[PDB]
């Protein structure tokens, strides 16, 4: 089905023709537009008072990558390199070797936060919920070099945001 948008025939009776003469001379439809802007002048603005108020987000929000631990304190990552394989930007670099106790653990875990497209594939591929994107979105820097995270920066983030990260994963893991 279809409909015409602009296929009307204006009437040519005297009253209709005089109606358009009053509109042309007395600027009726222009003053109709002034009234609409006047109404918005008396509506409550939608502005929020940042930084004291924040915009609503959801548990699925994708922000600053981070490395998590088990409740015992042991790292969750076991250097499987699935995240490094799936990262469409090749923003992840990993090196691993047997640990002193024989565990499969990384010796390098870097994310280039300037190559990263903040897509979330790294946390979908992870089989042990080790690399996650947290809820922090305010981490702008003053130099380019502060955005090249290494394993120490990522483990510090995980310890720093674990209280909020765990609650979000609790709220959404039933959809995953």
């Amino acid at each position: 089905t279809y409909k015409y948008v602009n296929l009307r025939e204006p009437s040519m009776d005297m009253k209709s023709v005089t109606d358009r003469a009053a509109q042309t001379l007395l600027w009726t439809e222009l003053i109709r537009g002034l009234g609409m802007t006047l109404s918005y002048l008396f509506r409550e603005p939608a502005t929020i008072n940042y930084p004291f108020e924040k915009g609503p987000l959801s548990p699925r929000f994708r922000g600053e990558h981070a490395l998590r631990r088990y409740p015992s304190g042991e790292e969750r990552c076991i250097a499987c390199k699935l995240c490094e394989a799936v990262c469409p930007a090749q923003a992840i670099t990993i090196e691993a070797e047997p640990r002193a106790d024989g565990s499969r653990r990384t010796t390098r875990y870097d994310i280039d936060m300037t190559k990263c497209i903040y897509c979330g594939f790294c946390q979908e591929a992870c089989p042990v919920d080790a690399i996650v994107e947290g809820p922090n979105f305010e981490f702008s820097t003053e130099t380019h070099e502060e955005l090249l995270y290494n394993k120490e920066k990522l483990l510090n983030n995980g310890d720093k945001w674990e209280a909020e990260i765990a609650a979000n994963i609790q709220a959404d893991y039933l959809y995953r």
Binding site: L30, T37, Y40, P45, A46
Partner: protein, 316 residues
């Protein structure tokens, strides 16, 4: 004491222009469902002061102008004339009580085109010149209707004295007998001051002439432009919304007259937020094909109407 009088007129004008920038940004904001400046001082009352200091300690460009003397003459002329158009305004007593004050304001207003033309030359850019030519052609075209409309109104007043317009409207506003002229006077003032929907200069995607100016020199063009917006709306209120004058309580006149002058200045900001922009060939046709035929016809009507009713005003 006269020298004190001049300063009591100049400084408040500049302060009014300074806080008009704030009011414009906040009225536009609320018509757009937002707030506007409310962080720099309470309700953004220090925003104008921050902007002024920032511009005057920012390095200016001063490109390789073809003259380098027109580049400095243009803002002097613009600001110098903008302040001069205030001296005959009765509020309710003029600083200078001219007999031909209405004609003085036309004369000084027609000289403001040079600052537009000179700054075009100084920029040394061929394209910047084209923008100056379009702005100049707009200003001269729409001051044809300012002169004829003003003449039509004065036929019901009897003189070019600005304070006689107060006496003329001692029983009724001139908006009532001459509302068709008021409509075309109000729109003609928007075109003169390059205001939306007539701002092709500031209307990017088609052109402005004051593009090479930054810092203090740019602010001088800005201040002159906004002082003309207040002045023309003060002229309109005197012309079409006469305020009764009580010689024993002159402050009563000033309060009522200021409120009208503000409401007409806010109408300029209201109209900017509501409409799109005219095309260059379309605002020229709005003048040479719509306003001018009506203005000429109404001029004939207003020359004859006083005669055929026995209502010619006194010469004095």
């Amino acid at each position: 004491m006269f020298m004190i009088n001049i300063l009591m007129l100049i400084i408040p004008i500049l302060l009014a222009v300074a806080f008009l920038t704030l009011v414009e940004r906040k009225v536009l904001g609320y018509m757009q469902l937002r707030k506007g400046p409310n962080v720099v001082g309470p309700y953004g009352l220090l925003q104008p002061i921050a902007d002024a200091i920032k511009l005057f300690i920012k390095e200016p460009l001063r490109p390789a102008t073809s003259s380098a003397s027109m580049f400095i003459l243009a803002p002097i002329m613009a600001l110098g004339l903008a302040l001069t158009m205030w001296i005959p305004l009765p509020m309710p007593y003029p600083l200078i009580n001219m007999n031909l004050g209405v004609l003085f304001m036309l004369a000084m207003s027609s000289l403001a085109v040079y600052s537009i033309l000179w700054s075009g030359w100084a920029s040394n850019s061929k394209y910047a010149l084209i923008g100056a030519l379009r702005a100049v052609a707009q200003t001269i075209s729409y001051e044809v209707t300012l002169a004829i409309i003003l003449l039509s109104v004065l036929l019901m007043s009897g003189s070019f004295t600005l304070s006689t317009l107060i006496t003329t409207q001692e029983q009724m506003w001139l908006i009532l007998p001459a509302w068709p002229l008021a409509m075309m006077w109000f729109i003609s003032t928007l075109a003169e001051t390059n205001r939306a929907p007539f701002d092709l200069t500031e209307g990017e995607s088609e052109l402005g002439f004051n593009v090479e100016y930054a810092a203090g020199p740019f602010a001088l063009f800005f201040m002159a432009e906004y002082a003309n917006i207040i002045m023309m709306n003060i002229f309109t209120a005197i012309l079409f919304l006469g305020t009764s004058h009580n010689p024993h309580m002159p402050e009563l006149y000033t309060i009522n007259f200021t409120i009208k002058s503000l409401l007409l200045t806010m109408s300029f900001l209201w109209i900017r937020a509501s409409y799109p922009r005219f095309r260059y060939d379309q605002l020229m046709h709005l003048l040479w094909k719509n306003f001018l035929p009506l203005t000429l016809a109404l001029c004939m009507w207003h020359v004859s109407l006083p005669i055929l009713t026995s209502g010619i005003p006194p010469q004095t």
